[model samples]
Target: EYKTKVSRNSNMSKLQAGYLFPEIARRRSAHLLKYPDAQVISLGIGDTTEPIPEVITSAMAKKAHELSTIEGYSGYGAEQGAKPLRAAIAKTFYGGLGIGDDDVFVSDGAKCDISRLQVMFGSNVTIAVQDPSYPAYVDSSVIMGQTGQFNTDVQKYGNIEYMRCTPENGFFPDLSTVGRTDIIFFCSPNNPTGAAATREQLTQLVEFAKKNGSIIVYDSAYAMYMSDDNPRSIFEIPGAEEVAMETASFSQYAGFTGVRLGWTVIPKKLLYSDGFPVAKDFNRIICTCFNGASNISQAGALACLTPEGLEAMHKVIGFYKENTNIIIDTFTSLGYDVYGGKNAPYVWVHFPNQSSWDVFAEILEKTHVVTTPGSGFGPGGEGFVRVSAFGHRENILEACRRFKQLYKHHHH
Candidate 1:
């Protein structure tokens, strides 16, 4: 009830989990304090550890060098993004989906784009997300005041639909039980659970969103990791262009984590309830709130589309897939229940009766390996942990060895 030109964004106080990564860091620090000599191997965050392909980095270097020239020097570019990079992205990723450069808005990363999209939607709308999906979807919505008060006991916010994705349901929520909301956030080759929705499942989701007149925010950041026939982009499903906007990144696939480049495709056919285009408003948000993506990053992402760059990118992807395979096999052999890690870079392992945080602690204390507590995702993720596959081969081999030794005698 106090104000001095600006009042508090009370929604800030509604954040229940208070951002999961920092808490994990605090525990890891405390553990290091207790066991000073512990050689901790982290399977926690999905940040890429691989080096960028030479073909990719060379393009960025060229752009960095060009900045010193009078003719090549540039000021603030288009707020939406550089035109050529947008065109390259559409051709490289969308292909026959009928999307174009005009529909793509390049940004620093998918996480930042989520916040900007939340800003465009404002505080009056309702939202829904997969129960154990990425934290950015929910956290950004909470910050925008799109959700109601947080209920700590339930570990959920009011007026926000958490479509539960559990082991029993194959990590895909039942759309029949998911109520209609203004926006539905869906991730393919999902982050925490690594479940890639089949064509039929996504058909149902598209139909459900259409029936509800909802806007779908599809995150296909892991599309490059799919080893099966699962749809890589929402537009792969017919009519998706009218109802969904897809976001993707080079963060994992091409080792662009620090390079920082991602794009959101908002089809011109997509519209608000009144028949006005949603892309128009989103573009205005881009123009008014921020400048364009870094030219250096855009240059690198452009190269990431070249034939040599694509080949190099896949090589890096193969390494992570192998890492995921090792993690999956190790967990399965240890007699623990493991799902995912086949088509994605995370293995969602369930250890019944123990809380996710406890599982994280047990593994860390016994094996000196750091992992993410699944409960940090949401209440639906309480008893599991997400094991990331983004690490060096040496670290991965060592972590798997530790896991086997820790559980050889007494299985979970």
Candidate 2:
């Protein structure tokens, strides 16, 4: 017999104690173990509560049934995605924005596409992310060895810039402070914080990226939630196409989280310093690593483009928007400092004197309402917690009642 040893990538050690969602789950599980009879209402994660609309489900079912017929049977679609779905997405979503079917790369979801993008950039690029934003951007870069070892004191990795997004700055990061980054990971109607970038803000961002020759990996997953005149896509800005690659999902927009369909837009005009087309490199990455999104899902996505299907999706989104309004109104009445929920599905609430995790745990224990601690997002998130609006109407109402009771007991 011989003893064997295995070595792992050294960069793995640089990750935090645990990822944000997993740790949220761990705490939730422990709480459930202690209070087995409790009715814990989860307004923590951003998972949708509604079923797929009939219009979409019908289309997916039709596609599934077609697979059973000899005449309609098809196998192993183009790695880039079926042309019909891509064309529909380009026409319906991008429309006259200059985005064509060839620019859209279909993927399972935005989160998976984000990881694949990291692979394309390799390990040498410097990254900048919005402070108190989605964790995937930072985590993926760490895994790719693009960052130095983590600094526990600052609670960030070396060579990675954290563009602080606070109320003082109108929830937009100051581009002046973010000097010389090769990649900037940006989210509009930002996750966790729920702040959507305004048109002027996005214009500044696009100018900054163009000035610095930085590639902006823009996450527009929550674009459908914007109610105002805010720009829905970065390409809406004039010079953004050259410096930005956009990723969007049907998860929130069409309630396709479980069904899994998303797309990334890499402009044909985008090029590297050496004059090679970035789209060609991204296309190669997609073909090499991904087979394609499920044919059924693509068919369902196609349905989402139809007028009737879009109407159904809008109703579902309106339901969630009502839930968001209730949460925002409740917190505002309770005299808490709250942000977001106007144009996004999350509300970011501040707890001035308490730790973010402490607020999260206290809410769970007292109100039986689960929430995500802001600290898990980043250092800027330390004294806050993110509350999601993806819940049933009754649950959101009950959670508001419970929140009122907890607030009166603690502060009154």
All candidates: TM-score: 0.97, 0.98
lDDT of 1 by residue, 30-136 (tens): 99999999999999988899899999999999999999999988889898888888999989889999998999999999988999999999999999999988988
In TM-score terms, candidate 1 sits at 0.97
Spell out the clash pairs found in candidate 2: none
Question: What's the distance in Å from true for residue 79, model 2?
Answer: 1.1
**Residue-pair clashes per candidate, as listed?**
0, 0
Displacement of the residue 63 alpha carbon in candidate 2, Å: 0.7
Cα misplacement distance, residue 104 of candidate 2 (Å): 0.3
lDDT of each: 0.91, 0.91
Give candidate 1's whole-model lDDT.
0.91
